Each structure stands twice: as structure tokens, then as C-alpha cells.
Ligand SMILES: Nc1ncnc2c1ncn2[C@@H]1O[C@H](C[C@@H](N)CC[C@H](N)C(=O)O)[C@@H](O)[C@H]1O
């Protein structure tokens with residue numbers, strides 16, 4: 001059977017190692033290029049990854065993310081789903097939303113989900129408190145498989161109220177229950193779940209607890225070890241249940 | 242002093258009657274072209290306005306809304322704000338978001354606000370329950386005036402939890418408190434508030450209760466009369482307070 005694994009590898013190199021039409025569900029949150037959007041100007045609370053400075057020319061960052069999304073479109077099975085978590089950023093005192101580059105991809109946007117994180121450290125009073133991230137639910141372009149009946153009532157809507165995972169030592173993770181919602185509704189046991197920016201391995205832990213197959217890529221061997229330790233101490237608990 | 246009024250007039254004709262740089266705050270929700278997006282195919286729960294069928298060729302609808310937004314950019318004062326309420330629609334089983342046309346306007350998007358309506362009559366289980374509308378906060382292009390300190394804690398964030406106004410006889414209105422948040426934070430007493438799709442006059446009632454000047458346009462004399470009756474029975478109550 002397929003060997004589930006977290007591979008230390010560049011995300012595009014990993015995606016290009018997968019055949020067409022081979023992944024049922026992708027759940028992922030890329031680096032957000034906050035430092036790079038600022039042209040390298042430091043800021044308080046700056047996200048610094050183990051082996052990545054998050055400081056790419058913004059136009060090049062957008063082209064890179066488009067290549068990622070286009071590879072995801074290739075590797076998705078017909079009827080599969082890709083959940084891409086991003087957030088509105090700020091550029092020159094104006095909104096800088098992900099939609100400005102997402103719309104050019106081969107993937108077809110099925111629905112935008114709102115992740116309500118409840119609170120944010122950013123209390124700048126020049127705008128409303130920005131505690132929302134977006135989860136773009138894409139499907140392949142050539143309705144997706146979706147079983148909303150599997151969810152509790154409080155996750156059947158387009159706003160998901162999930163607090164950030166403050167106990168996770170990774171600098172910018174998402175909670176396990178977020179990945180669980182995506183996986184449970186769009187896959188069957190044994191189906192392949194992929195996270196090409198696996199980080200602390202949240203998507204893979206969720207897939208494992210739900211008895212789905214899993215594959216993750218990240219460039220940090222420290223984060224791979226973080227996943228392995230987390231998997232070992234996971235009692236296969238599903239946080240939804 | 243300026244004569245506050247609800248005028249029965251086409252929205253573009255009304256906007257083009259205003260000089261440049263003359264309006265501090267716009268709050269508006271246009272017809273959403275749900276029937277027109279469907280190419281005129283009827284649907285249950287169809288919105289039918291008094292004098293408007295909501296059935297425009299979708300490309301022409303988008304060009305029209307762009308003309309509206311471009312006129313708003315012209316008539317806004319520097320530092321003013323326009324709050325444009327729209328919603329993701331569905332086309333051919335895929336997402337059809339307003340951003341696909343909003344991005345071409347002369348207005349500069351400052352922030353997207355999420356209006357959480359709590360529930361929706363649309364219980365189609367092929368997607369998550371779509372009870373969110375968006376409020377696009379734009380400013381003029383050549384930070385906007387904004388006093389978040391005037392709001393209660395529960396409206397300082399990017400999600401506003403406001404139930405729909407089910408007692409309003411207009412077929413598709415928004416609640417008074419929505420307009421109050423926008424007006425209170427971006428204007429001073431006496432400043433001009435405009436709604437070019439005034440409907441039941443919600444924006445104008447809110448402006449009047451806050452002692453702002455107001456101007457509204459709509460094509461229905463029935464809705465103008467609806468506003469006049471509503472204003473007369475309004476005890477100048479501010480729902481926020
Ligand atoms: N070229 C790249 N290929 C693969 N991973 C990368 C690359 N550049 C950055 N990363 C990783 O992208 C990840 C982004 C994280 N925010 C993801 C965290 C993850 N959602 C979690 O729950 O832990 C980081 O762990 C980076 O190490």
C-alpha cells in the first residue's frame with residue numbers, strides 16, 4: 001500500500017513528483033510573504049521560519065503561488081478538493097487580498113470559507129480588527145465530493161469559529177480541527193490527503209486520525225521531526241468528535 | 242442648508258448630478274442580479290422589486306456596477322468612505338464573487354468586512370451554508386477618516402453579527418445598525434451620507450438619527466413613500482445605543 005510520509009523537499013518539486021489525477025484532498029497554508037510584501041522592512045511579531053525568511057519579491061511570490069495552484073489542479077482527482085488558507089494583507093495603507101493572484105490559476109474556486117480566529121494581536125485602530133483568514137475551497141478544472149452530513153451543526157456554515165492553536169511551537173500553524181473538517185467531508189478512508197507546506201504536520205495528523213493516507217512536503221527537517229514527535233504522541237484522537 | 246431628501250431617480254443619473262469631492266460617506270447595496278446571472282431562469286424565493294426585475298445580462302450588470310463605483314470615486318471627498326454591500330453568487334456550480342468586477346474600479350479597497358447574517362434559507366448541502374455577505378470598505382483614489390472608538394466592543398472587529406431585518410417590508414433590505422456603524426465611524430454631524438440604491442431608506446434613517454445630512458436615490462416611488470412613513474415614525478433612535 002501507499003507509504004504515508006512527511007518528506008523534506010521543496011513544495012513545487014514535491015508536487016511535480018506526483019502523477020496527474022492522484023490526490024483527493026489538499027489542505028494547505030503557504031508562507032504569507034508578510035516581510036516580502038513590506039520589501040524587507042522588519043516588523044514586530046515577525047514570522048521567522050526555521051529555514052525560510054518569508055521575504056520574497058511580492059510579484060515573484062504571486063507567480064510562485066500560481067505555479068503551486070496550477071500543479072495542484074493537475075494532481076487533483078476529478079471531484080477532489082483543495083483547501084488553500086490565506087489572508088488579506090496590507091500594502092501602502094490599502095487592502096492586499098489573495099484574490100488578486102488566486103483568480104489566474106487553473107483551479108476553479110468553489111466557495112470561500114471564513115476562518116474566524118476570534119482575536120488578533122493587531123489592534124491598529126485605523127481599520128476593523130483583522131482576525132479573519134480565508135479558506136479557499138477549490139476544485140479541479142478539466143460538484144466536488146462533499147458530505148456535509150458528517151459535520152456537527154456548528155461547522156455546517158461558511159464561518160468556522162476555531163481559536164488559533166497557541167500550544168503548537170511552530171511559528172504559524174493552523175488547528176487540527178480545521179484540517180479535519182476539510183478531510184472528513186471530501187474523502188473516504190484510504191484516500192490520499194496532501195499538504196505541500198506541511199509545517200508542524202497538522203494536516204497529516206488529522207489525516208492519520210481519520211485513517212486517510214497522507215503526504216506532506218516542507219523544507220525544514222526540524223518541522224519534519226516536530227511532526228514525527230506529534231504523531232507518536234497522538235492517540236489518534238479526532239478533535240471534531 | 243442642504244436639503245435632505247430621497248429622490249426618485251436612476252442611480253447613475255443621481256450620482257452624475259453631484260459635484261466632485263462632495264460626499265463624506267456612501268452606504269449602499271445594489272440589486273444583486275440573481276435572476277440575470279441565471280439568464281432569466283426563475284428560482285424559488287426570487288427577489289422581485291417594485292419596478293425592477295433584477296434580470297440584466299451579467300456582463301452588462303458588471304459594467305453598470307463599475308460605472309456606479311467610478312462615479313462614487315469621483316464624488317467622494319478625499320478621506321471619505323464608501324461601504325458597498327454585495328455577496329458571493331453561484332454560476333455554473335462555481336463561485337461567482339463580486340471581486341471579479343470590483344477590482345477594476347477607480348475606488349481603492351481599504352478592507353473587506355464580513356456581515357454574518359447567522360442563517361440562510363439556502364440549505365443546499367453541496368456547499369457550506371452561505372449566510373455571509375461582504376461589505377467592501379472603499380476609499381477615494383486621487384487613510385480614511387475612521388473613529389473606531391465610537392463603536393461598542395462587539396462591532397470593532399471585521400465580522401459584524403447582525404441578524405437580517407425581517408420586519409422590513411422591502412424585499413431585500415439591510416438593518417439600520419449596519420448603516421449606523423458605517424456612518425458613525427466615518428463622519429461628523431452635518432456631513433453628507435449618500436445611498437444611491439436607497440430602497441426602504443435604511444441608510445437615510447440611520448443618517449437622520451445620527452444628525453448627518455442625507456441623500457438617497459431609487460427608481461420606485463413606492464419605496465420613497467416607504468421611507469417617508471418610516472422616517473415619520475422613527476423616534477430618532479440609534480440602534481447601536
Ligand atoms: N519552498 C517551500 N517548500 C516547502 N515548504 C516550504 C517552502 N517555503 C516555505 N515552506 C514552509 O511553509 C510552511 C508554512 C507554514 N505556515 C505551514 C504551517 C502548517 N499549516 C501547520 O499547521 O503547521 C513553513 O513550515 C515553511 O517551512
Ligand SMILES: Nc1ncnc2c1ncn2[C@@H]1O[C@H](C[C@@H](N)CC[C@H](N)C(=O)O)[C@@H](O)[C@H]1O
Pocket residue numbers: 250251252253269270271272290291292293411413414415416437438439440441442443444458459460461464
Ligand atoms: N437604476 C436604479 N437606480 C436606482 N435604484 C435602483 C435602480 N435599479 C434598482 N434600484 C433599486 O435598488 C434597490 C436595491 C435594494 N436591495 C436596496 C435596499 C436597501 N439597502 C434597504 O435597506 O432598503 C431596490 O430598492 C431597487 O428599487
